[PDB]
Description:
heterononamer; A: four-stranded antiparallel beta sheet; F: about 40% strand; RNA-binding; H/ACA ribonucleoprotein complex subunit 1 (chain F); dyskeratosis congenita (chain B); box H/ACA snoRNA binding (chain B)
Amino acid sequence: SQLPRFLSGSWSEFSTQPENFLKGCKWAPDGSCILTNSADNILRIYNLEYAEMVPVLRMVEGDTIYDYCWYSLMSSAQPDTSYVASSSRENPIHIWDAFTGELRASFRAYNHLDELTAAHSLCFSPDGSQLFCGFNRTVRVFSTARPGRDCEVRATSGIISCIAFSPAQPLYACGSYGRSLGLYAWDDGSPLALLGGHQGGITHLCFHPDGNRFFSGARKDAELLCWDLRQSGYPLWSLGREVTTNQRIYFDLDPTGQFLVSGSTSGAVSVWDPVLSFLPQKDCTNGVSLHPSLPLLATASGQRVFSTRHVHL
Amino acid sequence: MFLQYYLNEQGDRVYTLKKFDPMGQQTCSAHPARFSPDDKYSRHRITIKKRFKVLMTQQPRP
Amino acid sequence: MFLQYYLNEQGDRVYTLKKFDPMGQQTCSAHPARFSPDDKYSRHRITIKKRFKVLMTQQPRPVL
Amino acid sequence: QELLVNQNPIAQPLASRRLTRKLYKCIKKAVKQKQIRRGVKEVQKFVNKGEKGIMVLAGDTLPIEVYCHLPVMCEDRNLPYVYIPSKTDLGAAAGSKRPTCVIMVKPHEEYQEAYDECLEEVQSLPLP
Amino acid sequence: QELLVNQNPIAQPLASRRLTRKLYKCIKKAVKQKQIRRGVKEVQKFVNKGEKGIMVLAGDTLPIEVYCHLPVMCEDRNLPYVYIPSKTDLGAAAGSKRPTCVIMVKPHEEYQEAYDECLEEVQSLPLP
Amino acid sequence: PPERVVLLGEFLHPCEDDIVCKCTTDENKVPYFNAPVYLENKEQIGKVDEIFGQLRDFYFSVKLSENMKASSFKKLQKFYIDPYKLLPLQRFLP
Amino acid sequence: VVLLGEFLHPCEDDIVCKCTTDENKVPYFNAPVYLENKEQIGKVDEIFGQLRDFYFSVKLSENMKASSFKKLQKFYIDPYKLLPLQRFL
Amino acid sequence: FLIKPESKVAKLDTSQWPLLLKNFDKLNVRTTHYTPLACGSNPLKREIGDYIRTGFINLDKPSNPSSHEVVAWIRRILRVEKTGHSGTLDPKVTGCLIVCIERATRLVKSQQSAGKEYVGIVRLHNAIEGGTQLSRALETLTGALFQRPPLRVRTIYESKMIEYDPERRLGIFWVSCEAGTYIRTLCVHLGLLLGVGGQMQELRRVRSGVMSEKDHMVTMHDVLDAQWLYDNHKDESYLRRVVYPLEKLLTSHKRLVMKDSAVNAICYGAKIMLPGVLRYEDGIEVNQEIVVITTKGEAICMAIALMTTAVISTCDHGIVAKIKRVIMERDTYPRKWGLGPKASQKKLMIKQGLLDK
Amino acid sequence: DTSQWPLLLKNFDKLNVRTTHYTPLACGSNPLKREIGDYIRTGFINLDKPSNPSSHEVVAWIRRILRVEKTGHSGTLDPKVTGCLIVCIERATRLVKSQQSAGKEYVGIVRLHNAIEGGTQLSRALETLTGALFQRPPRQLRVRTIYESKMIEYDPERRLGIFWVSCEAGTYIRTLCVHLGLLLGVGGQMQELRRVRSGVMSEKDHMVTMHDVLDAQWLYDNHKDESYLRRVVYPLEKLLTSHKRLVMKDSAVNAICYGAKIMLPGVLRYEDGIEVNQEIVVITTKGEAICMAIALMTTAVISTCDHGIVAKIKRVIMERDTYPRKWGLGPKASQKKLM
RNA sequence: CCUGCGGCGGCCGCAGGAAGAGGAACGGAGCGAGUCCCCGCGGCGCGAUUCCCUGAGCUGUGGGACGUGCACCCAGGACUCGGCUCACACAU
């Protein structure tokens, strides 16, 4: 890590709007392309050295987008694994097709009085057979084949806002704006643990390729907490950040689990195992994403005002 | 068919064989439209007629 | 709530989804205010409304 | 309307002072080939099963009961239509002298341009 | 004047042209600390128990039944009050984007000199 | 399976993981609810869920059994119903 | 034979006569009309006009005298072929 | 406010009530002591069920098919039991045709023999002096004439011609003729008297008795549209503008108003007894046709007038009229002939012999 | 100047006269100038329902502000719908059944899940739905009419649509918006709703909101005044102005309120266009309603006869003994007792 | 004897009916009970450190957590009663 070379930037499609910003960026699980969301509720897909980058695909969505996710496998070895899932404010769950860009399926979820409820946080299973999404107090568990209205409700704190699974054992975790982490079994639905923690509302979780470590952020809490599961104890260490707004500030690892990267609300970019800063630019830096094969990185930009897109080495 | 007409001051038919009026408007045919015993387009007629207030229900009663 | 309206020349409600009129005055909500069955401020409402002549009573009488 | 005041009460939307002349010439350059449809008996049976094209209607036929069912036939498959002033001249532009009420032009053989030009302009005319 | 002719019928007294500006600046320099009140739910409950503060009201709220009870609540304990033109801007001067109707500024922490200036000036405005 | 079947109607656009159909049965018999719909040659594909539209030419829509898609079916196909499960138009009129 | 009716004009193939009997009595269908010269010059296709005095056209039997007669000359018929006008009212 | 008592006399003014019950207050009065019952509606405001059971369309005639066909079509559309028409028209002419539906049928015979009007076109082979000739010599055929189908007698009241065009040699005429007349054969004679040789080209019938074209004339699409409308929307609005009630044809006659108990007898076979009479229209003469009606305005039958008005003001018992053609069903009202002052006496095995009919 | 007189007594001058003599009494008064004790015991309010609470709750609050015992309403709004609601106090409760079944009007907003071509795809899918429809109620399937529709405004960036539906009592507008989606090929839901008509009363005139039903009562209580309350409650004779009128004269009035079928010697004036077996309103000489009753004679029979029944009472309004018993005392019925 | 329907101006067959044109209270109302129709994941206020919140989560013309009390789930129509009460009225 020695001041990563500046290889490319978009900063051209986000220009026709009075105010506009980005809300993350994600590599495909193979290497092919990158997924972007912005403040006009439009998804865009980019493909992998001196000129402005243009995207191959645009998806229009309507009101406002609470999430998105690449299909669990997405190996381009075979065609029918090119998915991207999406959620919005009134609408149901959509599943878009990543080559032509026309809708393939929907996954609506229904109340106890037959009105519709939107989802706040979705995530696929390891084997990619199910779809979990989180609601005001519960999670709903659709199967991937046989779409439509058919849930399998599991009950419980507050709005569940992000889900993530364990690499090597049956387990999953759910974070909420009620400032708590729930740990449940993959198949039954029993809370196996319930741990306290932050000051603000949780906004991201992430696991380590060991199956032991565990990392999590927050909404206005200016710190980042580490955990462990062999020891059911409480935070083992703690790190530093800065967050003065109510947005997701992403962070990630790299494939072998040696380096961690963060974002921040001044512009700078942490690194740990503590190492280096390497400013991306001058506005807020939300969303930071690392390629699964070669050394590469991607960073987004933007904040409310009461605007670029970069790739480094 | 040859018969033509045009209406007078008191709204009664004046028959003639010409093609314009003694002022210059055109003349309408006398005979009515052809008919077949299996039509199927009755909804199309009422839908249109309603929209411009030309249907018989919406005109003044005798 | 999204429903909005504004008055016509004839004095009837024209419903719309926008935030201004053709000429540029604002549009007010369609729905009414909240109500609770035990308020306590009935005296306050009357005398202010009186002061500017817009209470129910000082308006012209209807034609029954 | 250059002496045209004898209209039906169901004759919206109309054509421009020239929008029609353009259509007249398109109809002419379509007549050179066998790429047109004449009379109610033929438009009615063609536009039932497939048959995508574009329809012009006369604007002074009486009684209206001869072709009142056409506009809605159009709406149910989403084609366009438009009314031209006289039937004396539509009959002429077709290549006869007995007037008619309805004609249908379709996508051409080769050049397609004026055809495509008048298609996409007729689709934005004030709602009837 | 100044493109605001959409006022309630119960909007006296007003704040002119420079008065509004001065209060706006006072509001912000009050927002820096925990020394403000927003929303009807909070003004209504604060001013029933002492609280010697100052109230500004938006001047284009509809329907009026949402905050008609406050002026009289003020008279009965002898505070001052005043209407400003828009609510989009009061919401702004507070530091948000969504508008509000009623604001209450109070005696400052650092004993601001200006806080005493417009207190003493709005207390001679023509009786409503 | 049923003894025989009768002509219910033709296919049209799909809509959110379900297919809409026009009803063209003899007289104007209207179906039961959650009544199995069969294919041409005695295969089962789903059930009836919703009934709507005007009184004579009303539409309906199907909820598919597993293993089917909204892409398998082609324009104006034909689906067939068990004839015992129909109801006369009369018990609806006054 | 008695005086049936008198010539008026020739309309295409046939002439026209005006029944000028003594009493208003009408003939039968297909009665052979004579001159004073006993020979049939035609017979009678039809009658029309008022019930009081009526016109009737005569068809010619042979090609004969397509244009020989004057425009009021006299013709004849036997007195068997008549009938009283009362029977019609 | 209050409404005040006064002392002056009261009055009606009924010069706009629909159909028969119009100018009702001008019929001379006889009595007013009776009991009215609660059976049988006003003639207009009936349910849609039996509003079409008795009713008639003033249809306009299409141009190709023949009258029998037309009628069978209408009878299949409205779903009724039997229909008949006003008088046969030929497959190439158009005009009025008064189609009676299922109970108006009872007065078709009185329709078929009623004065009629026509308009048409004559085509001449060879040329003429001019239209002033055809003008002069269509006057020649006025009155009683002969004809046989292309040797019966007919009559013709009035006729005129309009305008002529010498170049194509065509002419126009309007005419008013008796029932049964053959209009086609009129042109042949017209030519023969012309001396050129005529033929029939166009013909249209203006007026069929009292129903003209100026009146509410309805085309043939309408009788399908309205039926469909009532069928799918439950709207009876359209169905009423086409079908009318039979009581509308019976309105230039004279009236005789009967009591609600002496009605279900006349609808079996019995005479018009003098007692059962409430009002009567002045202007009746002997041996006429009149119509007898209920208080409500329905029609009972048409009949023959025996007594003039002058007699019927002053009598003890009589017999007022005798039936001609009955319209109403039989058991509409209940039957009540077995009772009363005299009939009770007569049944109690008692007979002065005050008088017999 | 007869066009100006109030409810049920307006344009009276255009009626057929049967006599013009009687002798006026003392009792009763107009409904307008009726006293406050009972001007509230026989009245209705035209409420503008608020958003959050139920509809068996709003009436429960009006039954505790104005101190009474019985109330009823014209229809039923689910919580989070607004618009016209008609409530009846005491006596008026007996006219509930003919208000629960009249013509309604709504205004809505629907969200299409995916995108369509334009404004016209929705205008047509609306046009398609009219006349008797099927509707399964959220029990068996049933049929309900619809008289009209319209498309007011569509917005494509959010996919919102506004419409106006005239219909029959008992439909459902939540189910209509499922269907308007299900055929257009995308999907749909109902977002907002607002009734804008019930029976005769619109939202265009005579409308008030609960902050007056609670304020007028306060004012009357505390300062003994009524001018602010007789602007918020209205008398029964305003919601019958479309039925057919029959005027009975004095000394008959107490008879009918005791239960005796109407009889032709007493009638004083009758209205043109009466038909057999149809509801009419029988009124006094001052404007008060006595009852609703079913005619038994056409309006032309009535112009001939001399006596006999002319209606039978369906349900009666007035208070049993308001007028005094003056019956059994006339040219006949007095001479029957001489026997 | 008369009317209605049908068959080929008239005849024939079938069906309905024996006609004096009644009765100025005969047959109600208002309540009560029973059977059918209709048809408490909410709502309102108080206390607590300014009880927290201008979210990116709808919302400050409110959202939420903790202790707290309070109010609501009817009213109508049909049928039956082997119920109570008042009447049994042609309108001077």
